[PDB]
Amino acid sequence: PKAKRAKHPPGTEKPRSRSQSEQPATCPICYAVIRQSRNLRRHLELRHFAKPGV
DNA sequence: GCCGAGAGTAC
DNA sequence: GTACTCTCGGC
Ligand SMILES: [Zn+2]
């Protein structure tokens, strides 16, 4: 079928090896404070490079 | 409307 | 043994 990563099923333990590996992140354009670095990238495409490229 | 975090895998 | 990516839900 498919596989929507549903966090609804029980037994969802929160190991820190998921949030600890990530470290605070700031945007050097609008100083937006993004916690996870992976999200920082997404912030670039939404609040800056979100313009149609060429 | 954007943001914050969970899971599975590979080397 | 760790960090990686994609995905979902919330105020
Ligand atoms: Zn920014």
As a whole number of angstroms, the distance between CA A25 and CA A42 comes to 12
Q: A7 C-alpha vs ligand 1 centroid, how far in Å? A: 29
The residues that bridge with A26 in the sheet, in sequence order, are: A33
Cβ of A37 near strand B (distance < 7 A): no
Name the residue ranges covered by the structural domains of chain A: 1-54
Q: A24 C-alpha vs ligand 1 centroid, how far in Å? A: 14
Cβ of A52 near strand B (distance < 7 A): no
As a whole number of angstroms, the distance between CA A8 and CA A6 comes to 5
Look up residue A39 and give its amino acid.
N
**Range A1-54: architecture per CATH:** 2-Layer Sandwich (3.30)
Contact A5, A24 (CB under 8 A): no
Place of tokens 């190991």: A15
